């Protein structure tokens, strides 16, 4: 969504689903040619780390850093932690007609 | 919705290091060997026609070079999730449940 | 009793274990571990002491 | 020869999942090569490329497909397009049609004097063999730009895949139906190669396992009609094509193992030039992978007669690779390179 | 719609492709000079 000051508001999920498809296309480019096996296994475990980070990032000892110098929040953190998609919008949420 | 044409198969993170490694509970193999095979550290024997080794036997970089130049034409081994999905395809449930 | 427990004898047996405790996943060397020791404990530009 | 140290390393590792330490522990097996040590590797690359080009030059219809493509690009009376730039450009041991006529007139003359002498006294006559060798030595003088050269290599690959697919279909149907041993099969497949006299010899031999043969013969001598059609369109024997394909496989495998030895000894130059280009544009493992791709593209077009070192030539290619990788996405949006 | 029970299971890949209405090749999202994707 564009903001009032012309700034853009994108998600980190966009970055995850962008990098996964980028390295999937790079794996396709490496497998369509005669590549060394070290390069192939490197691309394979990079794809493995990226897919398992897109599933749940940051429950092991090391996570993805370097977005905005904060540790990364994944799609499972909307459900698991204190942010709580359940607790915020499923068993109680914002309703109209009120005042205090 | 949409899908991604994903070539090299990747395991699910909520099954491997999550309690209590259901792969090791269904295949009767310790989770340390699962973490070593699925992180490209060593090979694993899927199914061998010879009487040298059996199923769920890991092989390092030296042991595979020691066992490769002697025998052949009946030994099948992969590195990564391909060996695990082939082992889950080639296994049976009824005979294992009868043995248990 | 600590000397009874610890089996290390010389500096070469100690620096290998210290450098493996620093960063695992590397073959042990002498020069890199010695330079890391000098820059983490005997350095002034990279180690200030107030 | 270096797994004994790696086992003692991995005994200390408490299952590290970080690919950086993993990458720089698998790449540390091969040590640094010497300066004049890669000259023999380049000479093995030369021998492999020359063996592949001799396997192409022994194929007789490559000149026929080249003249067919030349007639198709010469047909519509006025062309100066980019397809003409993909042709020969001959090297010594700006293309005008006058030199093309002057260098293709004797090529057409050798083609029409070689084609008419095929049926003279034999298929593999010694004078005809000398004429084929002379035509091949003429054809080896003009060597293509590798775009159309790799196009003709891919066309020969498709023809080889068709021939080996028909042969594999015949072999798998025979093994599936009659279960014929290889001792009675390979000898006849090498010897006869033309007709069904080996089939009649297999009938004349009693062999009670071969009694399950009459209900499959309507496909057995139908699949050989395709081989007869291939021999009618080509006019070559099976053993010579297999020998050419084996020499082409050796000439590709020598260059392939040379590229393996090159990359396993020059991953560390890539990481040394890649760890200084990590200015927080994107995560650096993609930069390592793109540097490896740039190393491959620099090895694929490396010269020997220059006399300079490979690092200065490969630095420009790997910086071009890192530049196009850092300018490919660079954001959540798409911005072109000139911007 | 009416619902009575909830049952979850492991989703089949061809089933996921059956309720997948398309495939995305490159992860580029929108253009810079116009907002058309």
From Swiss-Prot, chain B:
DNA-dependent RNA polymerase catalyzes the transcription of DNA into RNA using the four ribonucleoside triphosphates as substrates. The gene is rpoC. The RNAP catalytic core consists of 2 alpha, 1 beta, 1 beta' and 1 omega subunit. When a sigma factor is associated with the core the holoenzyme is formed, which can initiate transcription. Belongs to the RNA polymerase beta' chain family. This is DNA-directed RNA polymerase subunit beta'. It comes from Escherichia coli O157:H7. It comes from the Bacteria.
Curated annotation (Swiss-Prot), chain C:
The gene is rpoB. It comes from the Bacteria. This is DNA-directed RNA polymerase subunit beta. DNA-dependent RNA polymerase catalyzes the transcription of DNA into RNA using the four ribonucleoside triphosphates as substrates. The RNAP catalytic core consists of 2 alpha, 1 beta, 1 beta' and 1 omega subunit. When a sigma factor is associated with the core the holoenzyme is formed, which can initiate transcription. Belongs to the RNA polymerase beta chain family. It comes from Escherichia coli O157:H7.
